[PDB]
Amino acid sequence: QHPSHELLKENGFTQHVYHKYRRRCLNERKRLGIGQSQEMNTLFRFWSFFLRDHFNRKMYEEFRQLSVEDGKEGYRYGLECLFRFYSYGLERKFRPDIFKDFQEETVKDYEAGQLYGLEKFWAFLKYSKTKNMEIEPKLQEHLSKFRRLE
Ligand SMILES: Cn1c[n+]([C@@H]2O[C@H](COP(=O)(O)OP(=O)(O)OP(=O)(O)OC[C@H]3O[C@@H](n4ccc(N)nc4=O)[C@H](O)[C@@H]3O)[C@@H](O)[C@H]2O)c2nc(N)[nH]c(=O)c21
């Protein structure tokens, strides 16, 4: 029924349906204001799921850009979506450039006094089969807090 749900089905993504849906969502974000469009929220959640299995760089960059913007104004649903995309998507297909972004946004989340991102990162490490991942020294320190909860 909802365009996000059509777009998420088996070979259900079409460009004209997505372009229409996106534009309305982004239009309603500007008209009503950040964090005040529920249709925009459906797009954060479409992106979180879609990009796990049909990654596209430009769509990823808008997702990350718009969710980081929302997060600084105080609306964290997009960032929560972003962090799930990182944690579940990098488990499907590891991409070292996306992994570096994941580290950058997690260290930012933690420096803001939040734990949602840091826990998704720890959870990625517990579930992932990727080997010889390079973890930033700063982030390695913050994760060191969860070893005590062992
Ligand atoms: C099996 N599992 C558990 N975790 C992570 O480990 C910690 C403890 O897990 P849980 O207690 O069960 O969730 P919890 O209640 O604590 O918080 P939560 O709200 O659930 O965040 C997670 C949210 O992912 C959404 N969602 C769900 C299903 C799906 N297909 N997509 C989703 O996107 C959904 O919305 C969900 O709620 C949490 O950090 C949790 O994320 C994992 N992480 C990775 N990479 N892979 C995993 O196979 C895995």
Author numbering: 796 to 945
From the paper:
La-related protein 1 (LARP1) has been uncovered as the mTORC1 RBP target that regulates the translation of TOP mRNAs through direct interaction. Among other target transcripts, LARP1 specifically binds TOP (terminal oligopyrimidine) mRNAs encoding all 80 ribosomal proteins in a TOR-dependent manner through its C-terminal region containing the DM15 module. To assess whether this uniquely repurposed fold is evolutionarily conserved, we crystallized and determined the structures of both fruit fly and zebrafish DM15 regions in the presence of a dinucleotide analog, m7GpppC, both to 2.3 Å resolution. Indeed, both orthologs adopt a structure similar to that of human DM15 with three tandem, helix-turn-helix repeats flanked by an additional short parallel N-terminal helix and an orthogonal C-terminal helix.
As in the human co-crystal structure, m7GpppC is bound near the C-terminus on the positively charged swath of both orthologs where the Watson-Crick faces of both the m7G and the +1C are recognized through specific hydrogen bonds. Interestingly, the human DM15 region shares 72% and 91% sequence identity with the fruit fly (Dm) and zebrafish (Dr) DM15 regions, respectively. Because the direct RNA-binding residues of human DM15 are 100% conserved in zebrafish DM15, we hypothesized that zebrafish DM15 would also bind 5’ TOP mRNAs. Though the sequence composition of the RPL30 5’ UTR varies across the three organisms, the unifying characteristics of the pyrimidine tract are conserved, suggesting it is a good model TOP RNA with which to probe the RNA-binding profiles of the DM15 regions from the different organisms. Both zebrafish DM15 and human DM15 bound this RNA with picomolar affinity. To ensure we were not simply observing promiscuous binding, we eliminated the 5’TOP motif by transversion, wherein pyrimidines were changed to their purine hydrogen-bonding partner, expecting that the DM15 regions would not bind it; indeed, that is what we observed. These data suggest that the zebrafish DM15 region directly binds the 5’ TOP motif. We utilized the difference contact network analysis (dCNA) to investigate residue-residue contact and residue community contact differences between human and zebrafish DM15. Residue-residue contact differences were found within the α4- α6 interface. The largest residue-residue contact difference was between 859-E899, within the α4-α6 interface; notably, residue 859 is a lysine in human DM15 and an arginine in zebrafish DM15. As compared to the human DM15 region, zebrafish DM15 displayed greater contact probability for multiple residues in the interface between alpha helices 4 and 6 (α4-α6).
